[PDB]
Amino acid sequence: TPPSIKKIIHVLEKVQYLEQEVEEFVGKKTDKAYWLLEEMLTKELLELDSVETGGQDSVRQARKEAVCKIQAILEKLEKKG
């Protein structure tokens, strides 16, 4: 059942790096970090959002988890900026 997991995985790694970034985020929306932060995050979300599962347990779990993370990192950034 060759799924699109490759997508959620790629974005997952991207979110990971961003996760560490947001964590180390200077703490000011004026910094370019926040710009590229939300920017890369937004693109990543829209990217994985176009995943084709058609009934895949793997993609399902990864899908929900992906949305949680992206939304998690985004919410964290907004709260810390």
Helix ranges (DSSP H) in the chain: 5-24, 32-48, 57-79
Residue 77 CA to residue 33 CA, distance in Å, equals 11
- Among the listed residues 59, 74, 55, 42, the one whose alpha carbon sits nearest the alpha carbon of residue 7: 59
Burial, 34: exposed, middle or buried (Cβ in 10 Å; 0-12, 13-18, 19+)? buried
Under 8 Å between Cβ of 59 and 53: yes
* DSSP reduced 3-state for 7: helix
Residue 20 CA to residue 26 CA, distance in Å, equals 12
Experimental determination technique: NMR
Looking up tokens 């709260």, which residue turns up? 79
- The fold adopted by the segment(s) 1-81 is Methane Monooxygenase Hydroxylase; Chain G, domain 1 (1.20.58)
Neighbouring C-alpha atoms within 13 Å toward the C-beta of 20? 5
Give the DSSP letter of residue 1: -
Residue 49 CA to residue 38 CA, distance in Å, equals 16
